Design a protein around this ligand. Structure first.
Ligand code: MG
Ligand code: MG
Ligand code: MG
Ligand code: MG
Ligand code: MG
Ligand code: MG
Ligand code: MG
Ligand code: MG
Ligand code: MG
Ligand code: MG
Ligand code: MG
Ligand code: MG
Lengths: 65, 188, 127, 36
RNA sequence: UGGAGGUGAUUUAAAUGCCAAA
RNA sequence: GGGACCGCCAGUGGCGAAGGCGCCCGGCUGGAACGGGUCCGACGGUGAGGGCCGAAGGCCAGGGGAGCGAACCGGAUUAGAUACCCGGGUAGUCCUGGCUGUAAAGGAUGCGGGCUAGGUGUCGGGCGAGCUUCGAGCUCGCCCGGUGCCGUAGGGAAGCCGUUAAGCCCGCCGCCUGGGGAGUACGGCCGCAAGGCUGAAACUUAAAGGAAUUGGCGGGGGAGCACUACAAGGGGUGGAGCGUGCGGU
């Protein structure tokens, strides 16, 4: 109902139709799967050290080249 | 109303056949005990006797009689895991197969599939010779042994070892297996 | 003791079916398909629909006393495609996350030894 | 018919297969009128 | 370095060429 | 219960005159390579007329019919859609006895003989040497016959071919003579039919055809770039009245 914070640890690359989406690796900070590292797609400027609020932590983005 | 129908089911315990030890292998639900007949369960040889080598051998047991809450089974067939035999067949080798219909000493009808993998490509006449050797060994074993002893030797690997030792004289081998067994009939 | 069942997973390019039965396969515990959790025909084979269906099936199985399952996953096979769709792996992962133990995993796609003739003529679909 | 593989080339003409079909259709009609 | 084969696939719709050059 | 088909191993690997031939065991049968101080003694090459074999499809009788699927019946797409896509579906595809004799049936290269640098893979047989778990096993070298690649002299318009010749020489048969009309008309033979083989003229035309070069283009591939491109944004024009320029009247 409030989501789970995750911390960005690595930048992979740009993607999307018009280069608007970035793929990152994040580490869960709270919840059932705290400590796991998964990759995600993010819209907007982002840098290492930012914190995202995920609404669910079971979907993983498909790897890009 | 549906969960009402689920409450009418009772659980029955399934046992392995007599010559495998007769150990418990699982449980199954049913409302009428007559409906449990002819059900089939598949278990690996590692579960019967614990050893991490024979985890790719699969045995099928079929329920034939129910008494109380217990179900007793018979041997029906054996097979090797598909992913296992799929990793044996490679290019620049030769695969030799033989399928035989046999009758054991005590009047059991069986169909047996054996397989041999050669180290390299070989000529077809050598394949025929190896297949003939396999046939002779299997016929002799079937004539000599009873049903239970034959099944135990086939699943343990004695027959394959004898086949490999005899067939080394035609060409060096890499593997030799009894690939599949199915029972067809039983004595009257 | 331990009640173990079997999870049959049917995965194609158009849908996904998850079917939990008992150890012998003759009694059905639960059954859920992609068309029972989504509204758009386009979303039936998506991984997310597979996750939802797997969660529903796992909950229904857990409430009835099942502890773990062995997995059998198949593509349509036969004269159709031999490759499972995108929802198989998502279905497998969701079952474990819901609380069920996982036994052995194998694929049981039916493969012909030169069987029958497929559709499309000798030129195939021309799109 | 006799073979003229030069006719199969597609530059500046229609397909030879259908020309052959059209000629065969035309020859049927003459044959029918001849039998009358 | 350069070649020859085989098996898979390949996300809606989208026709035409006037005036002029003379 | 039923009808069709034999996956991986499988290999510019094998066999056959070509068309073609792939589950296993048994019977009958054709051809070729290698080894040969065996036998006969020029018995040979090509082959007009003539004969036999010949993918798929089609036809004539009798069976069979799972899957697929001309014609056809419906659902869509579209300006229309007699189509491409989707759901069904008759003949046919399969077996027994005949007929038809056609393919980009292509190695687009007729067959026999002698000769003209090398290098390197692979299949069958034989010989020599060395290993070996003693295996109808393994490795290396040479001879003969098949099957691929790179290449010297020579050949060719070039692409390329090059002891598996499209090179130099000794033979025999078949075919061609600018593009269309036309593989048509008329006549003849063959076939149940569908069709097969043979095959002109009047007239018309300045090119048709081949190999390679430079560009331009592609609802082909790869790399890069732009607020007169997009994506994230800020402000607008298109509706009203008026200023000014253009078409028309
Ligand atoms: Mg649906
Ligand atoms: Mg159709
Ligand atoms: Mg289209
Ligand atoms: Mg020509
Ligand atoms: Mg002759
Ligand atoms: Mg051919
Ligand atoms: Mg050679
Ligand atoms: Mg060369
Ligand atoms: Mg005539
Ligand atoms: Mg612009
Ligand atoms: Mg924009
Ligand atoms: Mg305005």
């Amino acid at each position: 109902d409030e989501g789970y914070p995750a911390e960005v640890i690595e930048i992979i690359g740009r993607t999307g139709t018009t280069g608007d989406v970035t793929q990152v690796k994040v580490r869960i900070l709270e919840g059932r799967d705290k400590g796991r590292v998964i990759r995600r797609n993010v819209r907007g400027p982002v840098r290492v050290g930012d914190i995202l609020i995920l609404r669910e932590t079971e979907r993983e983005a498909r790897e890009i080249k | 109303a549906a969960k009402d129908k689920w409450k009418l089911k009772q659980w029955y315990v399934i046992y392995a056949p007599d010559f495998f030890g007769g150990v418990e292998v699982g449980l199954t639900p049913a409302d009428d005990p007559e409906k449990v007949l002819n059900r089939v369960v598949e278990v690996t040889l590692k579960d019967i006797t614990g050893d991490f080598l024979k985890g790719h051998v699969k045995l099928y047991f079929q329920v034939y009689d129910v008494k109380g809450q217990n179900a007793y089974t018979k041997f029906k067939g054996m097979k090797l895991a598909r992913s296992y035999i799929r990793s044996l067949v490679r290019r620049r080798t030769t695969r030799i197969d033989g399928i035989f219909n046999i009758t054991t000493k005590d009047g059991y009808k069986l169909r047996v599939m054996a397989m041999v993998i050669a180290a390299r490509r070989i000529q077809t006449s050598q394949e025929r010779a190896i297949r003939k050797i396999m046939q002779e060994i299997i016929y002799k074993k079937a004539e000599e042994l009873n049903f239970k002893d034959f099944v135990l030797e086939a699943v343990n690997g004695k027959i394959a070892a004898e086949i490999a030792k005899e067939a080394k004289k035609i060409y060096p081998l890499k593997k030799a297996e009894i690939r599949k067994i199915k029972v067809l009939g039983e004595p009257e | 003791k331990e009640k173990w069942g079997i999870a049959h997973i049917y995965s194609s390019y158009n849908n996904t079916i998850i079917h939990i039965t008992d150890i012998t396969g003759a009694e059905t515990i639960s059954r859920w398909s992609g068309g029972m959790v989504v509204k758009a025909d386009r979303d039936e084979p998506s991984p997310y629909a597979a996750m939802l269906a797997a969660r529903r099936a796992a909950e229904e199985a857990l409430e009835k006393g099942i502890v773990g399952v062995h997995i059998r996953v198949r593509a349509p096979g036969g004269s159709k495609s031999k490759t499972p769709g995108p929802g198989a792996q998502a279905a497998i992962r969701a079952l474990a996350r819901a609380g069920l133990k996982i036994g052995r995993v194998e694929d049981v796609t039916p493969i012909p030894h030169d069987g029958t003739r497929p559709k499309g003529g000798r030129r195939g679909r021309r799109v | 018919m006799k073979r003229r593989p030069r006719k199969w080339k597609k530059k500046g003409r229609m397909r030879w297969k259908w020309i052959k079909k059209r000629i065969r259709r035309l020859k049927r009609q003459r044959k029918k009128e001849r039998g009358l």
